[PDB]
Amino acid sequence: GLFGAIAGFIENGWEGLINGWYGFRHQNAQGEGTAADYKSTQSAIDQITGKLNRLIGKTNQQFELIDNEFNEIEQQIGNVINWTRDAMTEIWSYNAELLVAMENQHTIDLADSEMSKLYERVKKQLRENAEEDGTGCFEIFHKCDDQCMESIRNNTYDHTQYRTESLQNRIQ
Amino acid sequence: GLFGAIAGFIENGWEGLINGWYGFRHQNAQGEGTAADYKSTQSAIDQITGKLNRLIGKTNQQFELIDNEFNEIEQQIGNVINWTRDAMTEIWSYNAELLVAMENQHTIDLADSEMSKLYERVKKQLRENAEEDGTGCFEIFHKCDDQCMESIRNNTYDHTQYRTESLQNRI
Amino acid sequence: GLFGAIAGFIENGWEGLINGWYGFRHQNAQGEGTAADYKSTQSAIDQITGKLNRLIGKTNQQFELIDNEFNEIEQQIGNVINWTRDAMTEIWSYNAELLVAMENQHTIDLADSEMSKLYERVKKQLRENAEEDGTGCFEIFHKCDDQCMESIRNNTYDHTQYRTESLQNRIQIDSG
Amino acid sequence: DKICLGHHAVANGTKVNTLTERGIEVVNATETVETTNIKKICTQGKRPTDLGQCGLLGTLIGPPQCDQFLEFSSDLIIERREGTDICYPGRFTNEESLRQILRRSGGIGKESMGFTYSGIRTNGATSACTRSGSSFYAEMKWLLSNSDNAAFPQMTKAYRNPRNKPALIIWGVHHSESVSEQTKLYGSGNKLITVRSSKYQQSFTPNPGARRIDFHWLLLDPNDTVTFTFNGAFIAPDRTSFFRGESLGVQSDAPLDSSCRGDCFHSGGTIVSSLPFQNINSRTVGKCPRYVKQKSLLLATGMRNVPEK
Amino acid sequence: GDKICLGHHAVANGTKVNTLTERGIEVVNATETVETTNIKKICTQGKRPTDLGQCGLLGTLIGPPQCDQFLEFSSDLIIERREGTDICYPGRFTNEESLRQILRRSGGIGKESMGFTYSGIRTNGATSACTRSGSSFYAEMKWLLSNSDNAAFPQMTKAYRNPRNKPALIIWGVHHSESVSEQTKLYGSGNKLITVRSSKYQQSFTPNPGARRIDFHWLLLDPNDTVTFTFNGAFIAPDRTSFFRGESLGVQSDAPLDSSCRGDCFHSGGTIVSSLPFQNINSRTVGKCPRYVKQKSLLLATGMRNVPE
Amino acid sequence: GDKICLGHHAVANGTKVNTLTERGIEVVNATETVETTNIKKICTQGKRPTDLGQCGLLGTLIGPPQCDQFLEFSSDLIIERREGTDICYPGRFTNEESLRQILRRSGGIGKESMGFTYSGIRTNGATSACTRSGSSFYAEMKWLLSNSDNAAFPQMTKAYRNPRNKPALIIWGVHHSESVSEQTKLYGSGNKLITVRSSKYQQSFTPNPGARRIDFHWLLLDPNDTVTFTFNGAFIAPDRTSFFRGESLGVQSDAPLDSSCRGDCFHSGGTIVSSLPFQNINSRTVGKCPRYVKQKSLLLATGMRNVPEK
Numbered sequence A: 001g002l003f004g005a006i007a008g009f010i011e012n013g014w015e016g017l018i019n020g021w022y023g024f025r026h027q028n029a030q031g032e033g034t035a036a037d038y039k040s041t042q043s044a045i046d047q048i049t050g051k052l053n054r055l056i057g058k059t060n061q062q063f064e065l066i067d068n069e070f071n072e073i074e075q076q077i078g079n080v081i082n083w084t085r086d087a088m089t090e091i092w093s094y095n096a097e098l099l100v101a102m103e104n105q106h107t108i109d110l111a112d113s114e115m116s117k118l119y120e121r122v123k124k125q126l127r128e129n130a131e132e133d134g135t136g137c138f139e140i141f142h143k144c145d146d147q148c149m150e151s152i153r154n155n156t157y158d159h160t161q162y163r164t165e166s167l168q169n170r171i172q
Numbered sequence B: 001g002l003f004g005a006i007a008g009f010i011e012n013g014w015e016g017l018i019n020g021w022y023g024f025r026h027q028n029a030q031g032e033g034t035a036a037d038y039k040s041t042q043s044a045i046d047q048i049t050g051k052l053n054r055l056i057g058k059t060n061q062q063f064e065l066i067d068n069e070f071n072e073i074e075q076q077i078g079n080v081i082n083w084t085r086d087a088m089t090e091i092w093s094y095n096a097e098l099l100v101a102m103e104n105q106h107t108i109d110l111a112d113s114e115m116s117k118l119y120e121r122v123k124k125q126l127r128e129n130a131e132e133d134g135t136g137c138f139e140i141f142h143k144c145d146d147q148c149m150e151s152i153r154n155n156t157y158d159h160t161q162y163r164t165e166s167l168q169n170r171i
Numbered sequence C: 001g002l003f004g005a006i007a008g009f010i011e012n013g014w015e016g017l018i019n020g021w022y023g024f025r026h027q028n029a030q031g032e033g034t035a036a037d038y039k040s041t042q043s044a045i046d047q048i049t050g051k052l053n054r055l056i057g058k059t060n061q062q063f064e065l066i067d068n069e070f071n072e073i074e075q076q077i078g079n080v081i082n083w084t085r086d087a088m089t090e091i092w093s094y095n096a097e098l099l100v101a102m103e104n105q106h107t108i109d110l111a112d113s114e115m116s117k118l119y120e121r122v123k124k125q126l127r128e129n130a131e132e133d134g135t136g137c138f139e140i141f142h143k144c145d146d147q148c149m150e151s152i153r154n155n156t157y158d159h160t161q162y163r164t165e166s167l168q169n170r171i172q173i174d175s176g
Numbered sequence D: 001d002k003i004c005l006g007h008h009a010v011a012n013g014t015k016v017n018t019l020t021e022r023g024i025e026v027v028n029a030t031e032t033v034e035t036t037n038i039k040k041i042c043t044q045g046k047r048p049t050d051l052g053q054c055g056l057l058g059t060l061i062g063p064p065q066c067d068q069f070l071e072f073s074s075d076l077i078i079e080r081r082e083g084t085d086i087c088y089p090g091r092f093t094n095e096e097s098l099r100q101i102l103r104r105s106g107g108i109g110k111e112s113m114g115f116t117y118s119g120i121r122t123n124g125a126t127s128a129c130t131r132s133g134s135s136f137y138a139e140m141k142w143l144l145s146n147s148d149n150a151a152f153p154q155m156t157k158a159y160r161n162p163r164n165k166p167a168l169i170i171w172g173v174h175h176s177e178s179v180s181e182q183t184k185l186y187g188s189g190n191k192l193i194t195v196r197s198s199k200y201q202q203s204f205t206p207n208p209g210a211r212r213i214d215f216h217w218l219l220l221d222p223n224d225t226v227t228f229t230f231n232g233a234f235i236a237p238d239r240t241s242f243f244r245g246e247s248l249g250v251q252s253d254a255p256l257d258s259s260c261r262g263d264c265f266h267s268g269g270t271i272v273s274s275l276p277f278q279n280i281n282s283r284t285v286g287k288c289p290r291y292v293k294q295k296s297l298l299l300a301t302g303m304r305n306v307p308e309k
Numbered sequence E: 001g002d003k004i005c006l007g008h009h010a011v012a013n014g015t016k017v018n019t020l021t022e023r024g025i026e027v028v029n030a031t032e033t034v035e036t037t038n039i040k041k042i043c044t045q046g047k048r049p050t051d052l053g054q055c056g057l058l059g060t061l062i063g064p065p066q067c068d069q070f071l072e073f074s075s076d077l078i079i080e081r082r083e084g085t086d087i088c089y090p091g092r093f094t095n096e097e098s099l100r101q102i103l104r105r106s107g108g109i110g111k112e113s114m115g116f117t118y119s120g121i122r123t124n125g126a127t128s129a130c131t132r133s134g135s136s137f138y139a140e141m142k143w144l145l146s147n148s149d150n151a152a153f154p155q156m157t158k159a160y161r162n163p164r165n166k167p168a169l170i171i172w173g174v175h176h177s178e179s180v181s182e183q184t185k186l187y188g189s190g191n192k193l194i195t196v197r198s199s200k201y202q203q204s205f206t207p208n209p210g211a212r213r214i215d216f217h218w219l220l221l222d223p224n225d226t227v228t229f230t231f232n233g234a235f236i237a238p239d240r241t242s243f244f245r246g247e248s249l250g251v252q253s254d255a256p257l258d259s260s261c262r263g264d265c266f267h268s269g270g271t272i273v274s275s276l277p278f279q280n281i282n283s284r285t286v287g288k289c290p291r292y293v294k295q296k297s298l299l300l301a302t303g304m305r306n307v308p309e
Numbered sequence F: 001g002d003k004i005c006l007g008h009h010a011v012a013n014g015t016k017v018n019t020l021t022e023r024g025i026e027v028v029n030a031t032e033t034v035e036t037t038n039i040k041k042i043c044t045q046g047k048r049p050t051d052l053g054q055c056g057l058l059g060t061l062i063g064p065p066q067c068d069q070f071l072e073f074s075s076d077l078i079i080e081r082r083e084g085t086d087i088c089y090p091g092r093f094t095n096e097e098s099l100r101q102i103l104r105r106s107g108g109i110g111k112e113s114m115g116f117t118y119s120g121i122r123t124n125g126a127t128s129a130c131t132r133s134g135s136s137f138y139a140e141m142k143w144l145l146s147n148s149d150n151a152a153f154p155q156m157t158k159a160y161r162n163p164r165n166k167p168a169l170i171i172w173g174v175h176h177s178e179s180v181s182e183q184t185k186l187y188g189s190g191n192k193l194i195t196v197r198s199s200k201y202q203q204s205f206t207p208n209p210g211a212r213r214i215d216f217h218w219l220l221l222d223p224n225d226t227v228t229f230t231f232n233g234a235f236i237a238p239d240r241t242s243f244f245r246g247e248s249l250g251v252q253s254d255a256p257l258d259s260s261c262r263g264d265c266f267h268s269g270g271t272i273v274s275s276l277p278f279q280n281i282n283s284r285t286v287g288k289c290p291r292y293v294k295q296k297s298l299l300l301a302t303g304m305r306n307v308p309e310k
């Protein structure tokens, strides 16, 4: 999309992330693990819900019969009605298709945006303790156990705690 | 916000910033200081003005009376007109609702974009002399007086002048 | 643009880049050189073409005459017809104006997006071996000859190869 | 050690269209075009009237078929294919205008206008309108001369609207079978019917040659008066109609069902949907999703699907 | 340590707007796009208005007393009023609304004599229904009749060529007497026949006695074309014909005129003065108007997302 | 030292377009979405056109001398001309415009004898207004009148059942004489009534004498349904009825035919050949056409923002 993450620098999606829309996949000495990010996922869902609240369950306005199936009306009025109705149909068909096309373009870009935001959040969080590898991953230049990995997802990671160690590894 | 700056990593706006739309707030050995950025502010205002030019002061089509308020016209034709008119009401009501919704979505994202562009401008400007807070702030690793702060604002800051000082403060 | 590259931090376009939409201009000991980027150019074209497919060559809607251009029909029904037609003209002129305006906004921003994407992609490739000057260039902190430049363009650049030379030129202080 | 960011995907996504792409695959999508029709008239919550054999306009004048519908009260008037307005040949002028007023009328209440006669007949009947022998339109009086070829006297009957809502006035012009048929029923020579109010005048002459009774009508304002002047060939109203409230008129071959609720109707039944559009019927009545030509228009409700390889 | 922080402005008290994604999200500033502010007047500044009042628009052609002051008039804004009437003697125009539509945009009418003079008949037909310091008639018309009770009205032919650059609005009347004997009184005895003929129009009229009315009929006569009248009684003849001046807008209202406001969008209850693209004031308008919408308010954002301190 | 720069293309002079926020912003390339190029001809290539010329479309049903060459015709593109005339004898079709609309899309017409034979009346009613080798009449019609001046025209009944698989276009005329005397001469004295009845249609007609004319009326007769004519005079009877062939377009235009260009969108000023979504040429069009818009130009950006070099 417009933001370059989903279907961009991030190769593909994870089918095993049944717990949310976006997430983290860590890798340390204890093995790998996957956790879903609530905040980013809920943000995306709320926006799609927004779209649904707009389009679904609207209060339509009343229309009556203006012609007759059982007793054909005078030919002149009838033809004008047929001409008007069909032209309405053409406008509404146009409007409907455009609406969906436009909304979908925005939805995909919206989802891509939320991925980009989350990625960028982690980057700013990790400061000088990590380098981005270009596939959406962050190479941590210190040792980060399951609790440490937690503190990144949890957004409670104190970069000062790990800074000196990681700078030594980045430079050597 | 598609760009995640306004109502994103920037916690809130500044009610004290009566100067413009976007700005800088700095801390040093001389106290706090707030100033507006002209370039970005004007860029956002100019675009919103652009939307208004499109919607306001439009020339319209002339429409005549096809109906009679004082003398009821044949109900056959009357009901057709009323049907058409109501259908037009249904179409324009939709168009109008969608137009405003779509425009508002964009305006919000557009403004957010300008904030991010300004923040990114400053990031590239500061090079290896600063680090990101995460809240929209740049932690400067050298002593930056009021003149140094202004240089950052009006894009004349020379990162070379402070690089040696910054890097050794960063270890 | 929404992404701040085109008409943004990149000062201006290159009139000499006739081989594509997006490109690389390098400077090294061997000289200057310009090359197009295919992946980014074609992604922007495919998206534009997509728009053209939606609007050009469509199956048109069917039309029939309800008026008489030789002998005016009765005034009343004739006035109703004109009224309805003009209303249709009003709707379609609005649709057309808006569609085109909305598309052009997205189109410009889309193209800007791709420029940003290609820029960020290169940024990620170079890792800790280069810095952004703020004008759309990366200052490379190691000798990068024509082949090295090539490896950046075709995405085969291995930053590990050049890291030690780079950090020596980047971190120009004593490390204790 | 490393932390990697990513997003969900499914094996089988849903293809949707965007501004730049056709059939791009997303995680999930929802239909916006309703295509499920209920082949019934959903009458739950309503007070429906199925006219059946009775034509909507027949309810006003009362041929045998509409004896059951002289006074109806409904909010959903269902017209059927087999409905006829007449028994004796003829037709209403501006017939569709009158139907359109009736369909939304909320039903009709009848009230006696109170016309009495002397020196003439009021017992006019026909074999075409059979109702236990030979009879006529239940709300109409057929006026003749006292015997064959007798003179019909110039007459004036007037009705003032007592109620606080408009009254529907109907009257008939009997066109005789032949020139001498007209003189047998009524007087000799030229016949004329004048109908006046504060905002309506029109005169009527009979045209003999093909037997028929044509019906004409007007809407009389509160406290206003209809003046009838006639010397023959005149079918007189015995009762007038007052509208009850609000209703919705439907034309359909669909059966009524009082166990489903609905608000949008068409000839093929009821459309029940929260969706913005429908591909079911371009001609609908009531509160409906807008008709579109497309069978399906999928709105994306998830990200771009990029599955694992 | 020193730091520079980036941010944006905000107000404590923002405006709630709707997006595609969110209902009632707070932005810094927003401007209305739906006009709801009406002016309960017909704004006539910069315009040349004609307030027809008691005169009905069609009356301007035939000239009942109500329309004496509008026999000729020049306007770009013709205003019709509920109390306006076209006639003094009972009767109606043929295709009345069609005529009203061409006249509303005529830019006013200029009158011209048709040069009809008569011999061997009376020209001074008058009625107490059209009073003008006594019994009078339609100002633009002549009621033709025999020299005395029951005298034969001579077979006549009257022709008029349109000597003008633009089409002439030709009018004539048929007089339907109260009785046959009355028709015999005013004109001769026997069949009465009126034929009107141009190169595009052909139609013959016979009076229908019993009715007591003067019905008007009309045609547009092309330049250099000729209208020929053939009659032997019951004919209400034109003395004058009409010519349109240019362009105008027709307005139907009960709102007083106001020379001190300017507008180009008019309706039943006044004038809409606005630059906004939409209006929720009246669905029925004339002139250059914002498009009617059923929403009271649709706020367009003119500022960023508002996030207070 | 060494450096690599990322950038994009530009041109010296780009094309101005409009966006949501900006007016006349310059992009690298753009394309027109509103068609303004008209072809001043009716493009008839790959079609079977019918240039009606002197003959009015409605005339093809009743058949005045000018429509002799069109009494039966087969087309997919019917071209009506300004000089076209439906009649010879004075008169008009009732509902003429809705009948024209039906005929324009008919695909042409085929004629079949209704098989009405007559006894005790004259059948050879003619007029010098319809000259065609002397005084003739409408080719598909029959002017019925009494055996001699003033004789009583007998009360009569004629019925025709549609024997085909498609609707029959039934046509009839009412003759309005110059005067009461002339009606009496042709059809006998007394009043006249014409009644036309099918299982869907029911109308009565009385002649209104005063000015010579024959007015035409019509109905569509369903397959297997019967039309019944009852009349004692002033009746113009059908001899043939019409059956439609398939599908066609009808244009009103004075534009010449051109068999060297293909087209599917037509109007009074010729042919619109376009693959564009909109057009500013004509609001009255027939066929497969772009939607009419009031704007002359709507340039769609097919490139990025143009930022020329300095």
Ligand SMILES: CC(=O)N[C@@H]1[C@@H](O)[C@H](O[C@@H]2O[C@H](CO)[C@H](O)[C@H](O[C@]3(C(=O)O)C[C@H](O)[C@@H](NC(C)=O)[C@H]([C@H](O)[C@H](O)CO)O3)[C@H]2O)[C@@H](CO)O[C@H]1O
Pocket: E124, E125, E126, E127, E128, E129, E135, E143, E145, E176, E177, E178, E182, E186, E212, E213
């Ligand atoms: C209660 C009663 O019957 N009283 C009558 C009274 O009607 C009558 O007055 C005159 O009656 C004649 C009948 O022929 C007309 O109706 C007169 O109406 C006028 C009018 O409308 O003003 C007079 C006018 O001069 C006439 N115009 C002419 C002759 O060109 C018209 C005209 O004939 C009709 O409108 C045509 O339909 O009628 C009316 O005054 C008197 C006799 O004077 O006798 C009382 O007993």
Ligand SMILES: CC(=O)N[C@@H]1[C@@H](O)[C@H](O[C@@H]2O[C@H](CO)[C@H](O)[C@H](O[C@]3(C(=O)O)C[C@H](O)[C@@H](NC(C)=O)[C@H]([C@H](O)[C@H](O)CO)O3)[C@H]2O)[C@@H](CO)O[C@H]1O
Pocket: F124, F125, F126, F127, F128, F129, F135, F143, F145, F176, F177, F178, F182, F186, F212, F213
């Ligand atoms: C100046 C003058 O007085 N000249 C007369 C002239 O009128 C007359 O010619 C005949 O006039 C009659 C009308 O009275 C018809 O118009 C005759 O023509 C036709 C026609 O072609 O239309 C002839 C045709 O045979 C008739 N068709 C019939 C009988 O079926 C029709 C028909 O009657 C009418 O059209 C119906 O309205 O009329 C025309 O020749 C001659 C006498 O021949 O005398 C001159 O001095």
Ligand SMILES: *[C@@H]1O[C@H](CO)[C@@H](O[C@@H]2O[C@H](CO)[C@@H](O)[C@H](O)[C@H]2NC(C)=O)[C@H](O)[C@H]1NC(C)=O
Pocket: C068, C069, C070, C071, C072, C073, C074, C075, C076, C077, C078, C079, C082
């Ligand atoms: C409806 O509008 C059309 C034009 O849009 C009118 O048709 C013709 O317009 C032309 C040029 O403007 C005039 O020269 C003619 O006088 C009009 N008639 C014909 C037969 O070409 C038309 O008059 C309008 N309809 C009504 C009922 O007013």
Ligand SMILES: *[C@@H]1O[C@H](CO)[C@@H](O[C@@H]2O[C@H](CO)[C@@H](O)[C@H](O)[C@H]2NC(C)=O)[C@H](O)[C@H]1NC(C)=O
Pocket: D028, D029, D030, D031, D301
């Ligand atoms: C994908 O979207 C569809 C809507 O098309 C969802 O289907 C609904 O599921 C809920 C239960 O969660 C039911 O109550 C509804 O009846 C379903 N609606 C329709 C129209 O079928 C579905 O939940 C979504 N799937 C996922 C995995 O989110």
Ligand SMILES: *[C@@H]1O[C@H](CO)[C@@H](O)[C@H](O)[C@H]1NC(C)=O
Pocket: A074, A075, A076, A078, A079, A082
């Ligand atoms: C209009 O369309 C309806 C429905 O398709 C059809 O039954 C009818 O014949 C048409 N009316 C006219 C006047 O063409």
Ligand SMILES: *[C@@H]1O[C@H](CO)[C@@H](O)[C@H](O)[C@H]1NC(C)=O
Pocket: B074, B075, B076, B077, B078, B079, B082
């Ligand atoms: C159309 O609507 C108006 C009110 O807007 C109403 O007065 C009129 O009666 C309606 N016309 C018909 C034919 O029902």
Ligand SMILES: *[C@@H]1O[C@H](CO)[C@@H](O)[C@H](O)[C@H]1NC(C)=O
Pocket: E029, E030, E031, E032, E302
């Ligand atoms: C914002 O919009 C409002 C309402 O349209 C206007 O009155 C106001 O002056 C504008 N500007 C500010 C700063 O509030």
Ligand SMILES: *[C@@H]1O[C@H](CO)[C@@H](O)[C@H](O)[C@H]1NC(C)=O
Pocket: F029, F030, F031, F032, F302
């Ligand atoms: C520019 O646009 C035109 C159509 O407007 C098109 O023919 C062409 O392919 C485009 N590209 C170039 C390079 O001219």
